[PDB]
């Protein structure tokens, strides 16, 4: 079945650039052609780049002004988007999308880019701790989003809340929680296991009571 | 090349029928095909309908297109609305360049209002060797989704050094969260701290002690 797969963005500088990259398969690539599109909280869907089936024909949004360029790689059945010239309006996230003629038949799962001057900062975890008991993990002043929290590598799945985090003084923090019976924490240790990927960081901590 | 407005909200009961709007400003409605696409919250977008009318396989017959030709429009008719389908559906057309409407915020009413669950965590003794301490509140199982949140500091208001999020939804319900920013000298100091949640005209309160 179709599978469209962004990777390439993060934190990058006003004025540097970044280049996207979508890799598919579930279908001949060489037969439709491919598109971008971003999403703000604020201003919704924007339509970003269209490129041909066969490649030789490229459109642009308002928006981009000269600054992007859009491509594809029949052989390695990928597209891209570079971004030239970045703002901080450029801060979005992007998704790249399949076309059927005249509609997006497919979407990939969206990646964020970030356009600041601020650098990568890790975030520092703390193991938070006090029938059912409710633990915790404090992922506190990283920059930029996002980052992702499991517990006990997965094996934990319900009970799990992870909270939209606050930004305060340019970093970001947040909590994940979940909620075991008391017989887990007696009988295992659990595990909270943090991941930044703009710092490369991944963190597991044992919550201590 | 043109605008496509949608209105940004719609609220509406289970079981009920709703018809979401998409208004072409300039050129005709008819002369490009118009797609639809529903965005669960922190999700890509789905077809829900493509090239005015029709159906992807797998989604529901409940969905269907219409064009309104006198009002310039395309319409997403909603039957038999289900909780499920409480999503953001962005309409799309194109002339000379792709145009998107700016998304209909669809929310199914009927759900029981609930209290928040709150949950308070002290300061790790791991972040108080950096002399920091963070309390932090969780707030949880409540609808609807308005709260205002406060700290207290041995019984006092204590206001320096909030930070609360927005609710967010999760499944059914709403969170929220926040955190009250100490020295760590502040926080072995005082004999205790609470953090108090009022909603729908009810406080919820827990306390930290050192």
């Known amino acids: 079945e179709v599978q469209l797969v962004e990777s390439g963005g993060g934190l990058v500088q006003p004025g540097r650039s970044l280049k996207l990259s979508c890799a598919a398969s579930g279908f001949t690539f060489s037969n439709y052609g491919m598109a971008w599109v971003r999403q703000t909280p604020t201003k919704g869907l924007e339509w970003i780049a269209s490129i041909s089936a066969g490649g030789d024909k490229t459109y642009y949004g308002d928006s981009v002004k000269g600054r992007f360029s859009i491509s594809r790689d029949n052989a390695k059945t990928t597209h891209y988007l570079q971004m030239d010239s970045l703002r901080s309006e450029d801060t979005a996230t992007y998704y790249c999308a399949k076309t059927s003629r005249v509609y997006f038949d497919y979407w990939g799962q969206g990646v964020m880019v970030t356009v600041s001057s601020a650098e990568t900062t890790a975030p520092s975890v703390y193991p938070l701790a006090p029938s059912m008991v409710t633990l915790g993990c404090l992922v506190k002043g990283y920059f930029p989003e996002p980052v992702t929290v499991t517990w006990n590598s997965g094996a934990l799945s319900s009970g799990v809340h992870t909270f939209p985090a606050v930004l305060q003084s340019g970093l970001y923090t947040l909590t994940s929680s979940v909620t075991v019976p008391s017989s887990t924490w007696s009988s295992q240790a659990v595990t909270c296991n943090v991941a930044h990927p703009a710092s490369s960081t991944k963190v597991d901590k044992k919550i201590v009571p | 090349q043109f605008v496509l407005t949608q209105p940004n909200s719609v609220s509406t009961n289970l079981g009920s029928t709703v018809k979401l709007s998409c208004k072409r400003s300039?050129?005709?409605?008819?002369?490009?095909?118009v797609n639809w696409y529903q965005q669960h919250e922190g999700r890509s977008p789905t077809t829900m309908i493509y090239?005015?009318?029709?159906?992807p396989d797998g989604v529901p017959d409940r969905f269907s297109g219409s064009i309104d030709r006198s009002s310039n429009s395309a319409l997403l008719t909603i039957n038999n609305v289900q909780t499920e389908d409480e999503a953001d559906y962005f309409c799309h057309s194109y002339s000379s360049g792709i145009v998107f409407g700016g998304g209909t915020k669809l929310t199914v009413l009927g759900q029981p209002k609930s209290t928040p669950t709150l949950t308070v965590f002290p300061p790790s003794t791991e972040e108080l060797q950096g002399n920091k301490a963070t309390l932090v509140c969780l707030i949880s199982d409540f609808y609807p989704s308005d709260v205002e949140v406060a700290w207290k500091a041995n019984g006092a208001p204590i206001s320096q050094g909030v930070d609360t999020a927005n609710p967010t939804k999760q499944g059914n319900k709403y969170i929220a969260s926040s955190f009250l920013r100490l020295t760590a000298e502040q926080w072995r100091s005082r004999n205790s701290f609470t953090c108090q949640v009022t909603h729908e005209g009810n406080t919820v309160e827990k306390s930290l002690s050192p």
């Open positions: 300039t050129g005709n409605i008819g002369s490009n095909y």
């Open positions: 090239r005015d009318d029709k159906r």
